[PDB]
Design an enzyme around this catalytic site. Structure first.
Site, mmCIF file in Angstrom:
data_model
loop_
_atom_site.group_PDB
_atom_site.id
_atom_site.type_symbol
_atom_site.label_atom_id
_atom_site.label_comp_id
_atom_site.label_asym_id
_atom_site.label_seq_id
_atom_site.Cartn_x
_atom_site.Cartn_y
_atom_site.Cartn_z
ATOM 1 N N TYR B 51 0.980 -1.165 0.219
ATOM 2 C CA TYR B 51 0.015 0.034 -0.056
ATOM 3 C C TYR B 51 0.853 1.409 0.081
ATOM 4 O O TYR B 51 1.743 1.114 0.754
ATOM 5 C CB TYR B 51 -0.936 -0.164 1.183
ATOM 6 C CG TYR B 51 -2.446 -0.011 0.605
ATOM 7 C CD1 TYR B 51 -3.086 0.912 -0.044
ATOM 8 C CD2 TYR B 51 -3.219 -1.392 0.949
ATOM 9 C CE1 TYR B 51 -4.460 0.928 -0.402
ATOM 10 C CE2 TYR B 51 -4.655 -1.252 0.582
ATOM 11 C CZ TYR B 51 -5.287 -0.327 -0.206
ATOM 12 O OH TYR B 51 -6.256 -0.345 -0.543
ATOM 13 N N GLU B 53 -0.327 4.735 -0.834
ATOM 14 C CA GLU B 53 -1.101 5.984 -1.026
ATOM 15 C C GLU B 53 -0.411 7.118 -0.745
ATOM 16 O O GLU B 53 0.570 7.183 0.124
ATOM 17 C CB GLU B 53 -2.384 5.909 0.114
ATOM 18 C CG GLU B 53 -3.325 4.773 0.018
ATOM 19 C CD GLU B 53 -4.262 4.747 1.168
ATOM 20 O OE1 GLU B 53 -3.925 4.567 2.055
ATOM 21 O OE2 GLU B 53 -5.489 4.937 0.950
ATOM 22 N N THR B 223 -2.724 6.254 -22.158
ATOM 23 C CA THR B 223 -2.674 5.001 -21.724
ATOM 24 C C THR B 223 -1.027 4.394 -21.746
ATOM 25 O O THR B 223 -0.304 5.180 -22.839
ATOM 26 C CB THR B 223 -3.472 4.023 -22.120
ATOM 27 O OG1 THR B 223 -3.454 3.964 -23.774
ATOM 28 C CG2 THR B 223 -4.901 4.224 -22.052
ATOM 29 N N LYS B 226 -0.715 0.973 -25.390
ATOM 30 C CA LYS B 226 -0.982 1.058 -26.688
ATOM 31 C C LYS B 226 0.357 0.932 -27.783
ATOM 32 O O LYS B 226 1.174 0.123 -27.561
ATOM 33 C CB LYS B 226 -2.020 2.129 -27.241
ATOM 34 C CG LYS B 226 -3.431 1.993 -26.641
ATOM 35 C CD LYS B 226 -4.452 3.007 -27.017
ATOM 36 C CE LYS B 226 -5.747 2.851 -26.637
ATOM 37 N NZ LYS B 226 -5.808 2.959 -25.095
ATOM 38 N N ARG B 232 -0.688 -2.304 -19.049
ATOM 39 C CA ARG B 232 -2.057 -1.684 -19.031
ATOM 40 C C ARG B 232 -2.257 -0.973 -17.910
ATOM 41 O O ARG B 232 -2.087 -1.311 -16.504
ATOM 42 C CB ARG B 232 -3.268 -2.760 -18.997
ATOM 43 C CG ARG B 232 -4.503 -2.169 -19.514
ATOM 44 C CD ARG B 232 -5.456 -3.482 -19.769
ATOM 45 N NE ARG B 232 -5.083 -4.023 -20.877
ATOM 46 C CZ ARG B 232 -5.389 -3.671 -22.395
ATOM 47 N NH1 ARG B 232 -5.884 -2.702 -22.436
ATOM 48 N NH2 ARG B 232 -4.740 -4.362 -23.316
#
Lengths: 405, 405
Positions: B51, B53, B223, B226, B232
């Site tokens: 984690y 954050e 993104t 591509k 992804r």
């Protein structure tokens, strides 16, 4: 690893540091766990290459036959695990799972009732700096100032006064069992939908160690990476009547292409959760948390709510005249990872806090048991009672090293 | 794989089917590519357990020293690649990158001007079934009915009439170079922010084969999966003046914990894009697309805009009296993967369409060159001119197999 060390020395060196860190430290962050090598291999698969907008058997592109098999495996195993009528395994995160449910049943500015953030509620349950609190009108229910247990009469009063379209039950820092039956009864009285965010307790629910929200809630959201011990991501469970709307909320509503490799990893984690040994694991998590709670109390610590019913505990550090921030910093110095966390009715800001949040899911996964819980509590006692003694901190350092081998 | 085959036979068998499919088929979906084994290993790392954050050096939890190194590597390599003042590498997807920019500069109901979805715009640029069109008031600019090139006088007129707070440039199905200088000039005239979504063309921008939107746009979204040939996920680039707001939009605004393993994979992909051979790869992508375009025209096909400036082309199937749906289905039968796609001023619904979208990024990665482009066009000609001949389809099937070995 074979190709990453040659292709990218910098990234590999940092990953290796992280891997070694994960082994050396005592990880007590309540939201964290360690995934299996199988879960990671699924995440490291060629499935990242596939655009699969839409749903199994109903995709907006050809060549999805096999990723469809993977997603259906995830959905069906989730339904077996939790007894839900419908699963959506596409949410990128807990945040996006919650976002999609809100998108489904609410309009901009609608009133929602959620758990007070400083009493245990999550950021996505109405924080004014989060989309939830900016997009919808969140009101809050609280816990009792003495027992630190959700005040269900307060839930009822707030619901009757504010007339929310949706009620949210669940928490990021609530150490007791949540009464979903009472939440649904209140929801029914005011004509509100009930959403339960079980992110923290999802693995315990799967093992029958926390009441299942599925029979009581219109929508259940969760992360897959906490007590459920899966990859990082989200999931929505719901009644068949909302299945179509929930699916459309995820896509084309709030996301695009799903992470098929993560969804593969979700299926693997769900497969693991279905096994008998996961249930035994989950019992040890709760057993360990109760033991750790008792052992900390034996060291003279005060715990929020007086203990725990689940995987997590919250230490109220006010008796020791320490802030959560001070406690987190000094424990970091000795190799124990916690997070500062607001306590109910905290006199301190959420950036300072009067508490630390601790969970046992991660250490339990690594094989820690009751004896290790006793020692962790003893080390925490040694550190927090002697914050100014480098000798005590070095002893703590050595005892931590002894636990992690 | 070592552990997944034993732990989860079902998931492993499906992944192996997908792996073999990816090799056997001719993948012409314009949004897809094949990532390196290094990128996948990063995604399959223990970083999923963390984690994190917040942001590097400014996290809301301890023990992030090493994931901080990874995220900074991603941000700095992205800044080197595109010349941006600031990068945010935390977006879970293109959808979430766009969502965060909208969250940053817009209020609910604000007017936004984006590319007509049936002319090449993306779902997240104002679709009425997408959050963008539900949350904001989207108006659309179009392409010329003859040239199929963006009509910049229409962009200007729509901007002057509707007075958007934000203008969006970029597309999911636009085969020509976009004039970002003209977009910024229009944006300046009406006092609007300019956002450029370069998701499709990001790899070409990185290789200097498409004009860079960074100097002209307030915000650039993309993104990573591509033409950039990464894992992804999403990314936001912006001017330093919006850095703080953009970061707060991602967290605590619209997401929670980032996917640190995906961010590691992003860094790896950015490292690869910085190398000289990626630039050579990218040139071959564009060279291949232009060759494929010419070869298709030689087969008697009409292309939207009369060809391509980038990695993608759109076939207008009206001269052949075929729908995109019919074309996609029959090409699937022979091992060629395309998607049906609306053409500008399409007489058909977006569920039927009069076109197919084709891209060369994926086949180029596998080593296909100009001779292979000629053959792909010839096979497509054979199939689409003989949809009712099982003999022709079997020959096509064999010729596809010959290309993929």
């Amino acid at each position: 690893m074979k190709y990453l060390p040659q292709q990218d020395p910098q990234v590999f060196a940092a990953i290796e540091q992280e891997r070694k860190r994960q082994h050396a430290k005592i990880e007590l962050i309540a939201s964290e766990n360690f995934v299996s090598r199988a879960v990671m291999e699924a995440q490291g698969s060629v499935l990242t290459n596939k655009y699969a907008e839409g749903y199994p058997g109903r995709r907006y592109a050809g060549g999805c036959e096999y990723v469809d098999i993977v997603e259906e495996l995830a959905r069906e195993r989730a339904k077996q695990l939790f007894g839900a009528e419908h699963a959506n395994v596409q949410p990128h995160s807990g945040a996006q799972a919650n976002m999609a449910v809100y998108f489904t049943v609410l309009e901009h500015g609608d009133t929602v009732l959620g758990m007070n953030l400083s009493h245990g509620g999550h950021l996505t349950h109405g924080s004014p700096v989060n989309f939830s609190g900016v997009q919808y009108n969140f009101v809050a229910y609280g816990v009792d100032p003495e027992t630190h247990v959700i005040d269900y009469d307060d839930v009822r009063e707030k619901a009757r006064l504010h007339r929310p379209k949706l009620i949210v039950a669940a928490a990021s820092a609530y150490p007791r069992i949540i009464d979903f039956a009472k939440f649904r009864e209140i929801a029914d009285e005011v004509g509100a939908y009930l959403m339960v965010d079980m992110a923290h307790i999802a693995g315990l629910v799967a093992a029958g160690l926390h009441p299942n929200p599925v029979p009581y809630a219109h929508f259940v959201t969760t992360t897959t990476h906490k007590t459920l011990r899966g990859p990082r991501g989200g999931m929505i469970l719901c009644q068949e009547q909302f299945a179509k709307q929930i699916d459309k909320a995820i896509f084309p509503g709030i996301q695009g292409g799903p992470l098929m490799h993560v969804i593969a990893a979700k299926a693997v984690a769900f497969g693991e959760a279905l096994q008998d040994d996961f249930k035994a694991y989950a019992k040890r998590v709760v057993d360990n948390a109760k033991r750790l709670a008792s052992a900390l109390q034996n060291e003279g610590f005060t715990l929020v709510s007086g203990g725990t019913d689940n995987h997590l505990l919250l230490v109220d550090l006010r008796p020791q005249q320490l802030t959560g921030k001070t406690a987190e910093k000094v424990l970091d110095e000795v190799g124990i990872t916690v997070n500062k966390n607001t306590i109910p009715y905290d006199p301190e800001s959420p950036f300072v806090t009067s508490g630390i949040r601790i969970g046992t899911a991660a250490v339990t996964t690594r094989g820690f048991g009751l004896e290790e819980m006793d020692e962790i509590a003893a080390i925490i006692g040694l550190v927090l009672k002697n914050v100014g003694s480098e000798q005590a901190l070095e002893e703590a350092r050595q005892r931590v090293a002894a636990l992690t081998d």
